[PDB]
Every structure is written in C-alpha cells, then in structure tokens.
Design a protein around this ligand. Structure first.
Ligand SMILES: CC(=O)O[C@H]1C(=O)[C@@]2(C)[C@H]([C@H](OC(=O)c3ccccc3)[C@]3(O)C[C@H](OC(=O)[C@H](O)[C@@H](NC(=O)c4ccccc4)c4ccccc4)C(C)=C1C3(C)C)[C@]1(OC(C)=O)CO[C@@H]1C[C@@H]2O
Ligand SMILES: Nc1nc2c(ncn2[C@@H]2O[C@H](COP(=O)(O)OP(=O)(O)OP(=O)(O)O)[C@@H](O)[C@H]2O)c(=O)[nH]1
Ligand SMILES: Nc1nc2c(ncn2[C@@H]2O[C@H](COP(=O)(O)OP(=O)(O)O)[C@@H](O)[C@H]2O)c(=O)[nH]1
Ligand SMILES: [Mg+2]
Lengths: 429, 441, 372
C-alpha cells in the first residue's frame, strides 16, 4: 500500500484543501457524513491512499490543518465538508503572522510547530508503507510561507526517504494585493530549493486567464481557481488509486522529470477545458487533448514556455484509449516543435495511462512541464525584491523579530544561482 | 516428461502472461475454473499436457508459472479478473514500493528481500518435474523490475540450476516511440545479464508490431491487448513441438543447436507469416510457399531493422497445421534461389525445419483469421546490430552530461558500472561485424 | 594559479606479514615514476584484463619505502608554511580498505601522520609568539569575536573539560603578534554536520559578509601547544584498517593578532577532510556526495586556465562542497592525498579510488594483454 499524508497551511492552503477533499470524496463516492454510497467497487480498492478506516464503516481523510486560524477554522469547520475531518487535526494558534515571514518562521511559528509535528508523526505511524507527503500553501503570504517552509524542513529531516511533494501558489507579478510579497516569496523559495522533491508553481494570473478566456466565465472567484487546482492535483496521483494500461506513481514521475537535483520546479496543466455552451462542438480525441496541453495559454504557471526549452514533460491520460494514438501524438509533438525541446535528451516525454476517467468525462489528461522558461518568474520576484531591499523599505518589521539582515542576502543570492542554473540549459549544446 | 516454467517479470511481463495463458487454456480446452470438460468426454490421453499445467487430484489443472511486479496494481487485476481461481495463490506481489523506472532500485535496494521468495517458489515448482526443463522469462527492457529484478533473478538462477535452457522474451525500446526518458540507461544496464546468463533471447519492438497491426490486421487503433496476443502466438508456436504430434518435432535442445552458431550470438529475430485479417482471409490461398515468402519480407519483421542490410547466419522454420514436406522443400529451394536473401558463406545448409500437425487456434474476440496452416520463422542475422547502435547513441547523448545519474548513485550503484555496461554492448556489436565477414582463403 | 588543479599526492601502503602469508602480493600497485602511478590487475586465476593497466597522474608519489613522517616532510609541511605565511589551504584525503589513509593522516604518535605533524610544526613554531590565554576567536576567515574575561574563562573550561573527561615555519614574530590558534573538528554524515570536539557523552550552515559559507556554532577550542591539540583531537576522534563512514573535517585557524589587539587580523586556515571511500543509506549518501564532489573537482579542473571557461561548479548540491565553497570560489586553495594498497583483494576498490581522486587518470590497457 502507498499512503499519502496531506498537509495544508494558510488561508489559500486551507481553501484549496477544502475544494480538493470535496473533489476526492466525489471521486470515491464518499458522503459528507463519511459513509460510502458509490457504485463501482474500484472506489474502495485503493481508498486507503487518502482515507483511514473509522470503526463505523466510515472514512476519514489524512488531512492536517496547519495554522487554521479562527477566521479560517470557522469557514472550514462549518462548511459543507466540515464534519468529514477529525477535529484532532485542527491545529492552530492565535494572532497569526499577518504577512510577515519572520513571525511565521521564528517568533510565532516555532511555538506551534511542535503540535503539528506530533500530529504528523501520529498519522504517519498508522500507515502501512508511506509514499510521501503532500503540502498545499501559498508564497508571499504570512504563515503559509514561514511555517510552510519550517514544516517542510523538519519533516524532511524526520522522513528523508519519503517524497516531499509541494503545491505552492507563487506571487503574481502584477495582480497583487500585498505589499511585502517579494520578501516572503524570496525567503520561501530559498528554503524550498533544498528541501523538496518536486514543487508545482501555480500563479493566480494564469488561472484568471484560463477562467476568462477558456471557460468564458464572466465573474470568476476563488472557488473556480481552487476547482482548477484541485482537478490538476487529483490528476497527478490518479495512477496510485486506479489500474491502467501503463501505471505510474509519484516516484516514477520524479525519476523521469528531475535531470539534476536542483531543477525540480514544474508547470502544471490540465485538459480538456471549455465552456458549457461550446462543449457540443468539439469531440474528445487524443489529438484534441494533446493540442490543448501544449498550447501556451493553458499553462497554470503564467509563463510562456516558448521563451525557453522543455527540459522534460509528462502526460498522464485518463480514460479508455489506444496506445498507438497516444504514442503517435506525443512523437508528433516532439518532431513538429523540435525547436522548443532540449537537444541532448533523446526523448523528453513521459507517458502514463489510467483507464478510469473522471466521473462526468470520457477522457481527460494532466500535463506536467519542466522548462527553463520558468526562470522568468524568479527573475521578476528578484527584481521587485532588490527594488525594496536596496532602500530597506520594510526591514524593521522583520529585523525586530530576531532576523539578521544577512538572511535576506543569502536567499537572494540563492535564487539568482537557481536562475543561472536554468539559464545554463536554455542554450543549444 | 517435458515441462517449462514460465516466469514473468514486470507489468509488460504480467500482461503478456495473461494473454499467453488465455491462449494455452483455449488450446487445451481448460476452463477458467481449471476444470477440463474434455477429460470426461474423451476419458483418456494427456491433453491436459504437463508442459504447462500440473494436474491435481480433483481434476483441477494449475498453471506452472510464477510472476512478480513490485506494483500491486497490475497483479491485483489477475487476482480479481476472470482467471483468479485458475492460478495458484502464489502470485508474488511484494510492491509496497515500486522500482520507478530505476535499474538500481530493482537490482540493489528494493529487489532484495523478494528474490528469496521467488527463488523458493521456483524451487518448489522445479521439484515437481520428472523430466525436461527450460525457463521462459518474459520482461521488458527500460522499466524497473523488468530491468533490475530480472538481472538479479537471472544471476541467482544461473547458479542454482546452471545447465538449464533459459529463453528470454524481452520488449526492446523502439527507435522513436518511448514511454520514458530514462529508458536507455535501464536498457543498457541489462546487457550483462542478457549476455552471461540467457541462453537465447528473442527481441520484439512495439513500433514494428504497431506497423504490422495497422497494415496487415487493418486495426486503426491497436492497444497492448493485441500485441500481447501476437507475442502469445509466437510463444505457442515455439513450444508446439513439446505437446502435439508432428512429422518433425524439434525440442528446445535441437532448437537452440541449429540457431546459435557461437555462444555470444544468441539473439535471434522472430516473425509470423499468416497475420491476415478476417476480411482478407478470402481472396488468398495461403499456401506454404506464400507464407514462407512472407516470413522473409522486411516489412513483416517484429524488430525495426532491415535484414537486407545484413547476412543470415541461421534460420529455423516451425510449421503448424496442414503442411506437407514436399511444399516446404520447394519453398526453401525458392528462398535459396533469391539473391535478396544473403547467407554467410560459412553456413551452407542454413535451414532447420519443424512440422507440427496441430493447427493454430483463434482467441475469442481476437482479430486473427482461422487458418488451416501457419508458420513461425526465427532467424539469427547480423542486421540486429542496427537495433543496438541507435540505442547506444541515445545512451551517449545522456551520459555525456551525467543526466539522471544521481538517481542511480544514491541507490548503491557505483558510477563506473555505467561505462562497463556500455563497453559490453560495444563488444557485442564488434562480434557481429566479425561474423558477417566472408571467409578468406 | 598556474593551472594547479589539485596537485594530488599519493601514498602506497607497504605489505603486512599476514597479507604476504595469504599471497596478497600479485603486483597490483607500481610506479613508472614519482608522478604517474601504475595500477595493474592481480593475476586472478582463481574463480576459474590480464593487466588492465591504468595510469594515474600525481604531483608526487610515495612508495612503501616512504613512511608517514617521510610523506609529510616532502609534501604537506610546505602547505602548513603556506597557511601560516598567509594563505588558506584544504587537504582532502581519499582511500579504500587497507589503503592506509587512517594511518597516513592520523597514524601513531611516533610515525606521526600529516595531521599530528601539522599540529607539531604549527604549535612548536608559534611558541614564544602566542597569547597565553584565549582572547580572540576565529569564527570566520574574515571575522573574529573578542572575548571578555568570562568568555575566556568559559573557553578555557571547555578546553579543560575536553582534555579531562576521558618544528618551525618561516613565521617568527615574538613580541609583535600574540598568535591565537584555535581548532575545530566535525563530520558530515548523511548530509548532517555533527560537532566532534564535544567530548563523548547537528550543526548548520550560513554565509559570512562576503558570501563565503561557514558552519554555525562550531566548538572552536583555543590551544597552547602540540599535546593539547593532539589530545583534544584524539578525544574528538572517538565521536566520529579501520575507516570512516562519514566525511570528517578537522580545521585550525591562526589569528595573526598584533599586540594592540587588532580586530579582524589575518586569519590563516588549514583544514583537512578525510573522505569515506552495494549501512545502505549512508553508502548511497557517501556515493552521492562523492559523485557531486567528483563533478565539482572535475569542474574545478575543467575551469582552470587550460579552458578559461567557468561553466558551473555544482557545489550547492551537497553539504561537503557547500561548506568548502570558498575553496572552489578562490578564497582558498585545495590539494589531495590518495591512498592505495598493492593487495589483490583491494585492487578493484583501489583502482576505483584512483579513478575518483587522481590528479588525472588515463587508460594504458597494457597492450601485452590479449594473450589468448
Ligand atoms: C454538465 C456539463 O455539460 O458540464 C460538464 C463538463 O464536463 C465541463 C463543462 C466541466 C465543468 O467545469 C466547469 O464549468 C469548471 C468551472 C470552473 C473551473 C473548473 C471547471 C463541470 O463543472 C465539471 C464536471 O466534471 C466532473 O464531474 C469531473 O468529474 C470533475 N469533477 C469536479 O471537478 C467536481 C466538482 C464539484 C464537485 C465534485 C466534483 C473532475 C475533474 C478532474 C478530476 C476529478 C474530478 C462536468 C462533468 C461538468 C460540469 C459540472 C458543469 C469542465 O471542468 C472539468 C474540470 O471537467 C469545464 O470544461 C471541463 C469539461 C467540460 O467542459
Ligand atoms: N508489448 C507490450 N509492451 C508493454 C506492455 N505493457 C507494458 N509494456 C512496455 O513496458 C515498458 C516499460 O515498462 P514499465 O511500464 O516500467 O513496467 P515494468 O517493466 O514492469 O517496470 P515497472 O514500472 O517497475 O513496473 C514500456 O516501454 C511499455 O511499452 C504490453 O502489454 N505489451
Ligand atoms: N488560489 C487561491 N489563492 C488565494 C486564496 N485565498 C488567498 N489566496 C492568495 O494567498 C495570498 C495570501 O496568503 P495568506 O493565506 O493570507 O497567507 P497566511 O496569512 O499565512 O494565511 C494572496 O496573495 C492571495 O492571492 C484562494 O482561495 N485561492
Ligand atoms: Mg511498475
């Protein structure tokens, strides 16, 4: 068995977690009360991946809520799926960081991290064979950055073998409502580079773009963005739970995606996506999904991949399909767009196929990209960061928390080195 | 008695095993329950042949097979599919974690503590034979268990038994189509196993079988359930002589003797002539001459290579059904007449012929037309060198920059081993080029 | 520098009587000259490539005739001088089972290895020109901590607790510089830094003002003379042929502290890193670190004046290369001590060790092979 321990921190993390658990309980046909009222037996074949068995024929997800401060606890606990979670996992403090990385890491977070570590240890001790951890948080904020990185570091120290998977929301370059995003984001990236196995860069700008242009929504809200991210995050781990012609898991993706230890920042994507009113006009074929994935406007990372080269990509398809058609389409993508792929990899594409589609679809598929163009987002943050740090705009809100100024400089340098590393592989060689 | 232990390793191995055992059960009239209605119908004979089935007291016929995946998703289908009650409960799933397309994990770290169970089960199966043996190991290069655990298992088997024929049926990487980006590493790292331990290895390539299905069978959108059926037809045709009567029965020993001129050249190609769709079954006689000529067509080969670019060092024809020696001899003479088929000057005879009276069967829901006669050709040629050269190039394009190397180094594989593996491959290629040379007087 | 690369030095261990008793001598290790080691296969007729001869370049090679002190007097004493002269130097060590690295570096008290002799030379040289008590700690190569009375007493208590609970270089400045010599000893194990001078009963990294990484909260111990340093080191050794399973780093920092109490004087650092040569986990980590290290050294050898291209030195991929980032960058320099053994049973490992650690490695093949 291959169990996953799901962790989430911050307002963004908790809301994405709520939507994700809604989607998963829909997939396995689990009632909000925790009972099962599905149809196909395959739902219970691998329900242990996410859920523990409670005595009354009941299922309880392995969710750990990190700093569910009362403002978000009241939302989650009173929501539609508030009662599914076991209350012992509702770990939280009072007087949160307030968009201050130092408070989230050193001052306030160090007081609460012990409880979360104890809960994580108790949950992990119950697994037959743990596969890895899955974290959901947001950079540029408060507790989600500081405590998120603190928990990543301590858990990875405790469980070095197991896969540390992170789904993080980057700060958008333009659409921002927080002044001190650059400092928190820079420190979080510095902590993230050395302490995770794979991190998925999500940006709100790209999700808004997809909602406005692809789905033709006029009034998108955070619910829809969480819907898209949940769809992706379910698509990634679909092969662990259901059979298929060609199986895959987290470790298999990690091996076939991370050519060097520090190059583990990815661009997620999902297909198909289209408004309801037009769904009757387009038939679902593997060519259509393949066309929609590699379209630069479907990427959730807010970065055009054509500005660089794909180090490596992976397609995880779901639904009944022929392997010849899939292989032909991926080979066609490699051959036609050969200018946008790294030359010194003979084959840049990983393929996985699951034979159980989503509930309401014949076919679906999930894309994970890894390209040097991602370096762009780091550069933008770095620019904004220096534009403040040279003036010492808000250092007194940080240095007062027992943070020497030097901790900033190191982080900045680390980010620059990361950018330089990606820039090594943009040139043909 | 004559028995063969089928071992399957990895997902490709297990699916090929499913298709193969479906074909065997259909051939011997054995139900999915293991009961055999023909036993009470005939009341005699060994039609529940010991070559693939052990008979118990209750009349149930249990397959002689063991197989591993290190990923319970694939074998649990067998444990729940229609044949769950056929196989013995000893289908060794041990996949608390997968190898994850990593040779080092399969061979050194994860594969340990499972090889003992597999060797124990194979010992228990082998103790039940009062007669001939020979292992048929199925796997896929480029994967996990199929690359590392297969090497471990071969290494242990060559010591425990040693003087037993070990036939290998391995999925090779295609020139273009690939489902992984670390495939060349895992493929190259098994060359030592395939050289030192295997007694005869049959390579197949998915792109070639796709071409055959699209062209001959008229299947626009094939999937693995058809490629496995074709490979099962091959394997059934190879082992036909051990079970059914025939004018010329070729055993495994005489089979290997006439096909492997030297110890290090045990890599024959395979092909099957009457592929033929259902609708095309009419408008063609399918005489012995036609299928014999069709076997030599480069477009019908199961490995993406061109025999015209090399010389034929050995060839073995295995016929099934309504075949008479007169037509076989005439067809062989016609083949020898043609100048497109080049034989090395040091093999004047060139042909081994085996004929069997049991015609092939058609799987229900299949796509092969019922035919009166059929032929499977195996041929040891030098053109197979091409199939290695491309792969070696791909390996170099990664290894020059040490891409993905650390994923192995952290698993206990010393780095220098990579170089050693490639060197072995290099030596193999040179050997083939040193047997296509015409003799000098 | 003049494309110094590494300037690797080689020690070849002599045979032991018990080894010759088992016919271990089959001509595995030899030398064409003092610069190029020659490694050949033993005549392994057992178990039912006749020589496979490989050549390995070294700055100097030292056969079995050369003892530990003979090794030190010819190569490393200069480097000690070079450190006290005002440079920063880092001596790596590598070898395999029976190679003699743990005797080459540490050895006994009489035929002292490079480490005790470095202690002896440095501390004997600075007698009469040292501060009697601790006054100034070498935290960094470009920063120090001045100690008040209570801090000095506490450091003395630390030194005495570690000591109790179980000859000259060109530098000669009496009455001008009250040298402050401090030592440290830790180990990198599973990418975790453990302070080792702490007596028998995890450290962090961070950068200095110039971006040079250093280790945080390292138990630097002031020392007076040779024997104090040797005893502190010996006690710290217990917290770490017999060979390491971790990368054990000893280091010494000398503050050229003028009589006025100059803050941030010239800090001279000599460090020695004993490297570990399919316990699974550590082994993979060891190989992983070594792999990264090899790449870094290869980059450091590829990025010399021979190419005039910097490319990338992947020192960030491991703790070992990150902490020694300053020596890859140019803030310091580094050399290498390789150990081998002529025993047949060691040969493959020995060969691999040379291929990992030689100044340069080449294939000769010994063309007289292919007898059959
Ligand atoms: C009725 C109708 O014509 O609309 C369909 C539908 O298929 C469309 C319009 C759906 C629909 O999605 C959206 O309108 C949407 C809006 C904002 C953000 C994301 C989606 C649909 O909501 C989504 C829903 O999809 C599912 O049921 C999948 O199983 C999906 N389920 C959920 O996301 C889910 C949502 C709430 C509660 C429980 C589950 C899923 C996808 C991936 C992985 C797991 C599950 C379907 C069939 C529809 C509607 C209902 C309109 C689309 O969505 C998905 C993710 O499939 C948008 O385009 C795709 C495909 C279709 O075009
Ligand atoms: N011809 C054929 N090839 C298959 C089949 N199933 C899987 N493969 C091939 O198997 C190769 C990779 O093997 P994997 O998917 O990794 O399975 P594995 O070899 O057991 O390795 P694991 O991932 O550890 O299970 C691919 O190139 C596939 O084409 C099949 O049913 N028929
Ligand atoms: N995608 C998404 N992002 C969100 C949501 N809510 C908040 N955010 C983002 O999260 C950031 C604020 O981080 P926050 O949760 O306050 O950090 P915290 O104070 O530690 O909890 C902002 O930049 C928002 O854009 C949400 O529901 N969905
Ligand atoms: Mg698998």
């Amino acid at each position: 068995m291959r169990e996953i321990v799901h962790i989430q921190a911050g307002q963004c993390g908790n809301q994405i977690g709520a939507k994700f658990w809604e989607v998963i309980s829909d997939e396995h046909g689990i009632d909000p009360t925790g009972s099962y009222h599905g149809d196909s037996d395959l739902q219970l074949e691998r329900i242990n991946v996410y859920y523990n068995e409670a005595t009354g024929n009941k299922y309880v997800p392995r969710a750990i809520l990190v700093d569910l401060e009362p403002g978000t606890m009241d939302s989650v606990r009173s929501g539609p799926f508030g009662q599914i979670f076991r209350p012992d996992n509702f770990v939280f403090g009072q007087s949160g960081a307030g968009n201050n990385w130092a408070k989230g890491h050193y001052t306030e977070g160090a007081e609460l991290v012990d409880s979360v570590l104890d809960v994580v240890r108790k949950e992990s001790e119950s697994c037959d064979c743990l596969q890895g951890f899955q974290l959901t948080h947001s950079l540029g904020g408060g507790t989600g950055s500081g405590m998120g990185t603190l928990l990543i570091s301590k858990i990875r120290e405790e469980y070095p073998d197991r896969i540390m998977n992170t789904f993080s929301v980057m700060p958008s370059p333009k659409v921002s409502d927080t002044v001190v995003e650059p400092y928190n984001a820079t420190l979080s990236v510095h902590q993230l580079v050395e302490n995770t196995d794979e991190t998925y860069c999500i940006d709100n700008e790209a999700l808004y773009d997809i909602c406005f242009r692809t789905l033709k929504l006029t009034t998108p809200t955070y619910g829809d963005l969480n819907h898209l991210v949940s769809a992706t995050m379910s698509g990634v781990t679909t092969c662990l739970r259901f059979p298929g012609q060609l199986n895959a898991d987290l470790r298999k993706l990690a091996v076939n995606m991370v050519p060097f230890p520090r190059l583990h920042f990815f661009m997620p994507g999902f297909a198909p996506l289209t408004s309801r009113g037009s769904q009757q006009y387009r038939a679902l074929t593997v060519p259509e999904l393949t066309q929609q994935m590699f379209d630069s406007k479907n990427m959730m990372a807010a970065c055009d991949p054509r500005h660089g080269r794909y180090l490596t990509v992976a397609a995880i398809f779901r639904g009944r399909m022929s392997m010849k058609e899939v292989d032909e389409q991926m080979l066609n993508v490699q051959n036609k767009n050969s200018s946008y792929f790294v030359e010194w990899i003979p084959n840049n594409v990983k393929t996985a196929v699951c034979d159980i589609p989503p509930r309401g679809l014949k076919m679906s598929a999930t894309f994970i990209g890894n390209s040097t163009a991602i370096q762009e987002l780091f550069k933008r943050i770095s620019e904004q960061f220096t534009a403040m740090f040279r003036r010492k705009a808000f250092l007194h809100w940080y240095t007062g928390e027992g943070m020497d100024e030097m901790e900033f400089t190191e982080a900045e340098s680390n980010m620059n080195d990361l950018v330089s590393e990606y820039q090594q592989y943009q040139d043909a060689t | 008695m004559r028995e063969c232990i089928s071992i399957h390793v990895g997902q490709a191995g297990v699916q090929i095993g499913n298709a193969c055992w479906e074909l065997y059960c259909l051939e011997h009239g054995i139900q999915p329950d293991g009961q055999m209605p023909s036993d009470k119908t005939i009341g005699g004979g060994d039609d529940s042949f010991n070559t693939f089935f052990s008979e118990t007291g209750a009349g149930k016929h249990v397959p002689r097979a063991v197989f591993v995946d290190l990923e319970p998703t694939v074998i649990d289908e067998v444990r729940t599919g229609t044949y769950r009650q056929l196989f013995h409960p000893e289908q060794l799933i041990t996949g608390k974690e997968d190898a994850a397309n990593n040779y080092a994990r399969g061979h050194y770290t994860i594969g340990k503590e499972i090889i003992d169970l597999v060797l124990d089960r194979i010992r228990k199966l082998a103790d039940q034979c009062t007669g001939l043996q020979g292992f048929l190991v199925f796997h896929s290069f480029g994967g996990g268990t199929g690359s590392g655990f297969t090497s471990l298992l071969m290494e242990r088997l060559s010591v425990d038994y040693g003087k037993k024929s070990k036939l290998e049926f391995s999925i090779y990487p295609a020139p273009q189509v690939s489902t992984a980006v670390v495939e060349p590493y895992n493929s190259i790292l098994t060359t030592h196993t395939t050289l030192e331990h295997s007694d005869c290895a049959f390579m197949v390539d998915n792109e070639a079988i796709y071409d055959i299905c699209r062209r001959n069978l008229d299947i626009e959108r094939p999937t693995y359930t058809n490629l496995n059926r074709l490979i099962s037809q091959i394997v059934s045709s190879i082992t036909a002589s051990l079970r059914f009567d025939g004018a010329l029965n070729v055993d495994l020993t005489e089979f290997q003797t006439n096909l492997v001129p030297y110890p290090r050249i045990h890599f024959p190609l395979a092909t099957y002539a009457p592929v033929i769709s259902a609708e095309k079954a009419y408008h063609e006689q399918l005489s012995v001459a036609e299928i014999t000529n069709a076997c030599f067509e480069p477009a019908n080969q199961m490995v993406k290579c061109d025999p015209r670019h090399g010389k034929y060092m050995a060839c073995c024809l295995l016929y099934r059904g309504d075949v008479v020696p007169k037509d076989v001899n005439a067809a062989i003479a016609t083949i020898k007449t043609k100048r497109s088929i080049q034989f090395v000057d040091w093999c004047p005879t060139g042909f081994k012929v085996g004929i069997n009276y049991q015609p092939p069967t058609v799987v229900p829901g299949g796509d092969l037309a019922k035919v009166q006669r059929a032929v499977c050709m195996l041929s040891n040629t030098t053109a197979i060198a091409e199939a290695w050269a491309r792969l070696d190039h791909k390996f170099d394009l990664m290894y020059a920059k040490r891409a993905f190397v650390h994923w192995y180094v952290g698993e206990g594989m010393e780095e220098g081993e990579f170089s050693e593996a490639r060197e072995d491959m290099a030596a193999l290629e040179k050997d083939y080029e040193e047997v296509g040379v015409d003799s000098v007087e | 520098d003049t494309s110094e690369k590494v300037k690797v030095y080689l020690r070849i261990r002599p045979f032991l009587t018990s080894e010759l008793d088992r016919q271990e001598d089959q001509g595995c290790v030899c030398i064409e000259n003092t610069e190029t080691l020659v490694l050949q296969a033993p005549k392994d007729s057992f178990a039912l490539v006749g020589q496979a001869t490989h050549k390995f370049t070294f700055s100097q090679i030292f056969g079995p005739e050369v003892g530990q002190v003979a090794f030190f007097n010819l190569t490393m004493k200069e480097m000690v001088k070079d450190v006290l002269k005002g440079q920063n130097w880092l001596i790596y060590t590598y070898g395999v089972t029976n190679s003699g690295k743990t005797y080459t570096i540490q050895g006994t008290s009489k035929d002292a290895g490079i480490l005790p002799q470095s202690l002896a030379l440095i501390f004997n040289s600075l007698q009469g020109q040292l501060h009697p008590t601790p006054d100034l700690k070498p935290l960094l190569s470009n920063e120090v901590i001045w100690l008040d009375s209570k801090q000095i007493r506490q450091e003395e208590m630390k030194k005495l607790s570690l000591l109790i609970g179980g000859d000259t270089v060109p530098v000669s400045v009496p009455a001008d510089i009250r040298f402050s010599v401090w030592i440290s000893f830790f180990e990198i194990y599973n990418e975790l830094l453990y302070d080792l001078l702490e007596p028998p009963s995890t450290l962090r990294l961070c950068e200095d003002q110039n971006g040079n990484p250093y280790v945080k909260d390292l138990n630097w111990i002031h020392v007076r003379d040779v024997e104090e340093a040797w005893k502190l080191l010996k006690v710290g050794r217990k917290n770490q042929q017999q060979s390491s399973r971790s990368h054990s780093i000893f280091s010494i920092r000398i503050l050229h502290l003028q009589g006025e109490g100059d803050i941030v004087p010239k800090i001279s650092e000599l460090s020695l890193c004993d490297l570990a040569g399919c316990r699974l986990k550590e082994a993979g980590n060891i190989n992983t670190s070594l792999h990264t290290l090899g790449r870094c050294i290869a980059a450091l050898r590829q990025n010399q004046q021979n190419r005039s291209k910097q490319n990338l030195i992947p020192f960030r991929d491991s703790k070992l290369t990150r902490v020694f980032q300053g020596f890859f960058t140019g803030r310091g320099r580094s050399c290498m001590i390789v150990n081998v053994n002529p025993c047949a049973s060691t040969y493959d490992e020995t060969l691999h060790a040379a291929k990992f650690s030689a100044l340069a490695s080449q294939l000769v093949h010994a063309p007289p092979v292919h007898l059959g």
